Design a protein around this nucleic acid. Sequence first.
DNA 1: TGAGGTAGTAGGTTGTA
DNA 2: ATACAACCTACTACCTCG
Length: 745
Amino acid sequence: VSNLTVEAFEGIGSVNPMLFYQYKVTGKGKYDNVYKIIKSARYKMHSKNRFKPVFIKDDKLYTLEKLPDIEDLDFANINFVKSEVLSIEDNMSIYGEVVEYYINLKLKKVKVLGKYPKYRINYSKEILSNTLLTRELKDEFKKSNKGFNLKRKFRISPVVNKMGKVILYLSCSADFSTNKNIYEMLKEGLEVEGLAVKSEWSNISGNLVIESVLETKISEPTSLGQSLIDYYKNNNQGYRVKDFTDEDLNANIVNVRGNKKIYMYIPHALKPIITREYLAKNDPEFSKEIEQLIKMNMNYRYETLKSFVNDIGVIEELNNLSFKNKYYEDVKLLGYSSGKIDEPVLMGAKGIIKNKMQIFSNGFYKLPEGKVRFGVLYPKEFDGVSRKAIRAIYDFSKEGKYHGESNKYIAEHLINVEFNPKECIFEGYELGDITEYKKAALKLNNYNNVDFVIAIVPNMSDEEIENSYNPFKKIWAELNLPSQMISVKTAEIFANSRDNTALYYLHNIVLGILGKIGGIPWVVKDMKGDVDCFVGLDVGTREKGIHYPACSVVFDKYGKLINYYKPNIPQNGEKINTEILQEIFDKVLISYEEENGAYPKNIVIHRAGFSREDLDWYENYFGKKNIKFNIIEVKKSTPLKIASINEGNITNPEKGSYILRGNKAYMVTTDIKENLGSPKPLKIEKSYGDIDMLTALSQIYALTQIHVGATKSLRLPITTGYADKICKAIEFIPQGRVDNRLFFL
DNA sequence: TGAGGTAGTAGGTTGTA
DNA sequence: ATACAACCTACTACCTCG
Ligand SMILES: [Mn+2]
């Protein structure tokens, strides 16, 4: 066996309680509230004074060294108050801020390859290291001949205990930017209209996209009224723009939509946002090179943070403070509790299934109401490839005969399907306007002889002729007719190949067509812990001013889906009204009632989303309905990656390994081997209840093993995950009865 | 959209100290 | 009576799957 760890570093030696210098601030300016301008006075006095540390207490300000009272600042008149040795047990936070400042100050000076400063730093938790680590432990730059720069963005976040030992929390991430800019684009003469950009010289909310390039000169009076060069002279940014040569002032104005008004800027002032789209559009070979760099297994992350922490060395302003290089031998010494969950025993038609894959030799758990008829929209120039593809998937689904060869790996009649090419209908479509796609789906609606669509779509790639997926999904959703779609690439794979890649494609295709007609393929044999039904919820927070409604789901102790639900009436902002909770749980109790003849006696409410709800609603509710219950909150994205240790060897964890502290616990739900990344585990936090977190983790990991639209695990469990997919697909709600036939899966 | 895993990139909002 | 750090959302790209 083996241990687990969190990526953290214990500091050798301790922090001594140092003499800190108090400073009050007062709002001379228009913002009388200093609490809304404490950061601005902080950063200005920290800036103007050799970047000596300038910290923030609840309403005051610290420096570790003596900086005089400076009152030139038009909003803040900083004055000295007292000089007291700050007790560490009073402020864990400010001594952690010291450890942060001293790692940033030790690491500013650290250069690489002689001239080159390694870590571009501005004294915060985020540390940009210019050089990288390869797999062979070489500090090398990674750039292209275009010029796209991979950079590690290290994240320190140190904390220090009551007496003075320090804990350094690290997490490494990749980062793209390019040394080029849009000025470097146009002086090279490339097209820029439509590009996502980032203004370093003015901080603007919303996401920026390039509208156009005016041929008008940047050195003339503007529609703002004065020249933009005077606009940045009044920005006091003259140390950058004074570097402008005659060709620099020869440049042209480039405007960019900023969701409120276009911004009249110069191309030098903008970098393009380097989404990985922009990489593959601008250097594919580089992207294929760095994909082994950005996805990181744990040995590589340990080498990366080992380089980082050796670049700390020893810091001496904290009295010869140094951090170790290794991780922990156990998280017990940090305060979490480890373990790995038993993998759930899973059952199918003939009882227990051994692999998740041989269900197609075992047959499905439950089949829906009888007989279903297929139907395919196809491109009129992609006919025979499509016909061989449908013949492959239907001979799989009915005959079990893999590209014309029967195998004992496939069982007959695994759906009770009805398809016959002399009987059925394939309406065709031309790859064209979306209104043709819509009227084609209507024409396949006008014959009431199809019971299930398998449409064919153009690809997720291919910016050419318009993608047919979403208008089909809208029009087939409003019919409440499920539709497992297939790309033309997938059609070519089924038509060309005879090999088992088409079998993998076909596995996921058939589990999709099952889970959309409401059949459920496999379920757990026995749920650990005594629970009747699960309840998902989530609310999406999409853009500025977006307040979504909670879409539930309800499973059983077998975990098979029973009902999901969309509320009646609108909520109070994003804070959901209590009667929507009432309405949902009314549908929950009647759903489990008329599906199993009894009220639920244990309800696990896996919630994503914030506690805009109130627990005492649930307390009064399930006290009057006198049934115990459990609200485990699942938070989907967490930065705390987890590593395994086998005698110093740092590997990615096997799935189902967890770490736990009280009422928060982390756990990986997916097996990723080497070469592919570090598993980004789950965040689970029991807001209420009377069950041990061990059993809630066991139920969550089993509900990641019952994803029913794949042969592999969903990272989220099917409660929160299917709640999330429904909340993305809020246009795909049921017309009438809100029952089953998962449109998302 | 196989399909969902990691991975980035922007971006908004609170929950807890 | 207000923080800031996690969450969470949106789109892609890579890459594997008896
Ligand atoms: Mn699907």
